[PDB]
Amino acid sequence: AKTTQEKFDALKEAGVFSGYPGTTDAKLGQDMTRAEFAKVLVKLFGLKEIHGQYSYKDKNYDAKNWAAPFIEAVTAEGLMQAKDLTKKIFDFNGKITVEEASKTLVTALKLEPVKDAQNKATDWAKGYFEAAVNAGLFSKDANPKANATRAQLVEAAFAADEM
Ligand SMILES: CO[C@@H]1O[C@@H]2CO[C@](C)(C(=O)O)O[C@H]2[C@H](O)[C@@H]1NC(C)=O
């Protein structure tokens, strides 16, 4: 019965979340960005931020971009990668679908995708979305093809942290 905001507040006490500068609004109903998901992965899984390195050519991907040390850490692990692998564009403000987040979290948690799963996800992601639902990361009624909200990543992170 813990509310999503209560889960956010617990995770903020734990250092996994921090919210936005200068405001207490967690913006739980907005879509999470790729940069924000990289940060949460680093904190959840005990990865080390990598400073001073820039693998991507996106505009404003530089030392003034708060998310670069997190993005570099998850990139070096193979947990995330460029949206355009040839042009080296990460798309840091881009969105992330439920099924994409499922793949990444299941991998990071060392969970195994379910073979021969039947669900609404894209074919390549069905096993991962099923594993994520079975592990309590996302609701069985989540739309795997929709962009994941910050709320959903709070719920997922809270569940992953408890594991
Ligand atoms: C713009 O500042 C960032 O905001 C990010 C929002 O999303 C998450 C995942 C969060 O912890 O809520 O990450 C935040 C970044 O850490 C950063 N916030 C701060 C306070 O520096």
Automatic annotation (TrEMBL):
Pinpoint the SLH domain residues.
1-53, 54-119
Q: What is this protein called?
A: Surface (S-) layer glycoprotein
* Species this protein is from: Paenibacillus alvei
Source taxonomy: Bacteria, Bacillati, Bacillota, Bacilli, Bacillales
Quote the range of the complete protein represented.
28 to 190 of 983
